[PDB]
Structure 1
Amino acid sequence: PNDEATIKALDNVIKQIEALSVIVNRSEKADDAQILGPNTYKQLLEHLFS
């Protein structure tokens, strides 16, 4: 057997396993809420007499 192939295989396996165990999962999404800007009422026309 060639002893220069086992070392290469071990290198590849170790490097792959270590590259797999570094990536992390993290998100920064906001919430579905709203802003609710200001508002005022408005009056409808009316007629008055006495």
Structure 2
Amino acid sequence: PNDEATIKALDNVIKQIEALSVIVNRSEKADDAQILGPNTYKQLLEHLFS
């Protein structure tokens, strides 16, 4: 056996495992709530007589 291929294979598999073990899962999504604004009731036309 060529002892220099085993070392390279071990290094490669160790690098793969180390790379796979650093990935993090973090999400910073917003919320579905809607910001509300001010409003004023409007007046419908009316007629007054006595």
TM-score (norm 1): 0.98
Give 4+ residue runs of structure 1 displaced > 2 Å after superposition: none
Per-residue CA deviations over 1:5-35 (Å, capped at 9, x if unaligned) read 0000000000000000001000000110001
**Number of positions where the alignment pairs a residue of Structure 1 with one of Structure 2:** 50
Once the two structures are superposed, the pairs formed by residues 27-46 of structure 1 within 5 Å of their partners are 27-46=27-46
Aligned partners of 1:7 and 1:31: how far apart in 2? 51
- TM-superposed deviation, 1:45: 0.2
Once the two structures are superposed, the pairs formed by residues 5-44 of structure 1 within 5 Å of their partners are 5-44=5-44
Gaps of 5+ in 2: none
TM-score (norm 2): 0.98
